[PDB]
Motif scaffolding. Structure first.
Motif, PDB file in Angstrom:
ATOM      1  N   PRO A  81       0.522  -1.040   0.297  1.00 35.23           N
ATOM      2  CA  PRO A  81       0.312  -0.253   0.209  1.00 35.23           C
ATOM      3  C   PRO A  81       0.917   1.175   0.077  1.00 35.23           C
ATOM      4  N   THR A  82       2.280   0.888  -0.590  1.00 35.12           N
ATOM      5  CA  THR A  82       3.179   2.567   0.464  1.00 35.12           C
ATOM      6  C   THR A  82       3.695   2.495  -1.165  1.00 35.12           C
ATOM      7  N   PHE A  83       3.132   1.724  -2.172  1.00 34.85           N
ATOM      8  CA  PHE A  83       3.412   2.581  -3.331  1.00 34.85           C
ATOM      9  C   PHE A  83       2.936   3.919  -3.819  1.00 34.85           C
ATOM     10  N   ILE A  84       3.112   4.837  -3.774  1.00 36.69           N
ATOM     11  CA  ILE A  84       3.333   6.164  -3.986  1.00 36.69           C
ATOM     12  C   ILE A  84       3.456   7.369  -4.735  1.00 36.69           C
ATOM     13  N   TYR A  87      -0.250   6.016  -6.914  1.00 35.07           N
ATOM     14  CA  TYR A  87      -1.138   6.464  -6.696  1.00 35.07           C
ATOM     15  C   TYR A  87      -1.442   7.555  -7.091  1.00 35.07           C
ATOM     16  N   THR A  88      -0.150   8.642  -7.635  1.00 40.05           N
ATOM     17  CA  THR A  88      -0.248   9.973  -8.316  1.00 40.05           C
ATOM     18  C   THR A  88      -0.934   8.898  -9.796  1.00 40.05           C
ATOM     19  N   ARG A  89      -0.807   7.796 -10.692  1.00 44.10           N
ATOM     20  CA  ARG A  89      -0.932   7.775 -11.979  1.00 44.10           C
ATOM     21  C   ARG A  89      -2.662   7.546 -11.914  1.00 44.10           C
ATOM     22  N   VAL A 106      -6.978  11.026  -4.033  1.00 42.05           N
ATOM     23  CA  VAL A 106      -5.512   9.288  -3.236  1.00 42.05           C
ATOM     24  C   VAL A 106      -4.693  10.237  -4.215  1.00 42.05           C
ATOM     25  N   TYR A 107      -4.268  11.568  -4.234  1.00 42.17           N
ATOM     26  CA  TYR A 107      -3.151  12.625  -4.650  1.00 42.17           C
ATOM     27  C   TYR A 107      -3.039  13.107  -2.953  1.00 42.17           C
ATOM     28  N   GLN A 108      -3.841  13.311  -2.567  1.00 43.07           N
ATOM     29  CA  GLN A 108      -3.699  13.744  -0.941  1.00 43.07           C
ATOM     30  C   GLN A 108      -2.568  12.138  -0.467  1.00 43.07           C
ATOM     31  N   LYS A 109      -2.998  11.470  -0.152  1.00 44.56           N
ATOM     32  CA  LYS A 109      -2.554  10.062  -0.110  1.00 44.56           C
ATOM     33  C   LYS A 109      -1.840   9.650  -0.704  1.00 44.56           C
ATOM     34  N   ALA A 110      -1.082  10.163  -1.651  1.00 41.55           N
ATOM     35  CA  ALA A 110       0.571  10.270  -2.141  1.00 41.55           C
ATOM     36  C   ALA A 110       1.621  10.786  -1.294  1.00 41.55           C
ATOM     37  N   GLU A 119       5.510  15.781  -6.597  1.00 37.05           N
ATOM     38  CA  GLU A 119       5.457  16.167  -7.973  1.00 37.05           C
ATOM     39  C   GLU A 119       3.715  15.338  -8.306  1.00 37.05           C
ATOM     40  N   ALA A 120       3.112  14.505  -7.085  1.00 34.90           N
ATOM     41  CA  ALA A 120       1.919  14.740  -7.349  1.00 34.90           C
ATOM     42  C   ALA A 120       0.219  15.797  -6.261  1.00 34.90           C
ATOM     43  N   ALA A 121       1.621  16.957  -6.048  1.00 29.53           N
ATOM     44  CA  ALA A 121       0.713  18.039  -5.109  1.00 29.53           C
ATOM     45  C   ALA A 121       0.467  18.614  -6.598  1.00 29.53           C
ATOM     46  N   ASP A 122       1.583  18.570  -8.093  1.00 29.44           N
ATOM     47  CA  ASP A 122       0.803  19.931  -8.936  1.00 29.44           C
ATOM     48  C   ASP A 122       0.074  19.225  -9.869  1.00 29.44           C
TER      49      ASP A 122
END
Length: 133
Positions: A81-84, A87-89, A106-110, A119-122
């Motif tokens: 579950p820590t595949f970060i 979540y972004t993809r 899911v970005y929040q979760k990343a 990079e997920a916040a962008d």
């Protein structure tokens, strides 16, 4: 400083980490499909490595196989579950399903797993602004 080794000594600590590196280099040569199969053979070396499935999901977007990008991620969370970045993809895939609301979660979760994933916040700004047109 001569690194001593025998003829049957592995200079590579783990070949399973080396097959994923050349998987990423294949992609970097300007390749997508064969790169996925280089990740798939990397999966044959490390199946529990969930962030390795994240690269497959990241390619499936480009190939319009978003269904595969989702289902690979549904099991990927069960593997590790820590595949970060997966979540972004995943959230970028949800964006294509018009689920901007689910995507931003899911970005929040990343960022929740590790905020170094900024990079997920962008990508977050990308999904939130989309409904706020």
């Amino acid at each position: 400083m001569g690194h001593h080794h025998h003829h049957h000594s592995h200079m590579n600590p783990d070949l399973a980490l080396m097959v994923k590196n050349k998987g990423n280099e294949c992609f970097q040569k300007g390749d997508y499909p064969q790169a996925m199969k280089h990740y798939t053979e990397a999966i044959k070396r490390n199946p529990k490595d969930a962030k390795l499935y994240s690269n497959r999901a990241a390619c499936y977007t480009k190939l319009l196989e978003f269904q595969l990008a989702l289902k690979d991620c549904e099991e990927c969370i069960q593997l590790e579950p820590t595949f970060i970045k997966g979540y972004t993809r995943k959230a970028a895939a949800l964006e294509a399903m018009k689920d901007y609301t689910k995507a931003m979660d899911v970005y929040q979760k990343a960022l929740d797993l590790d905020s170094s994933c900024k990079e997920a916040a962008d990508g977050y700004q990308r999904c939130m602004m989309a409904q706020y047109n």
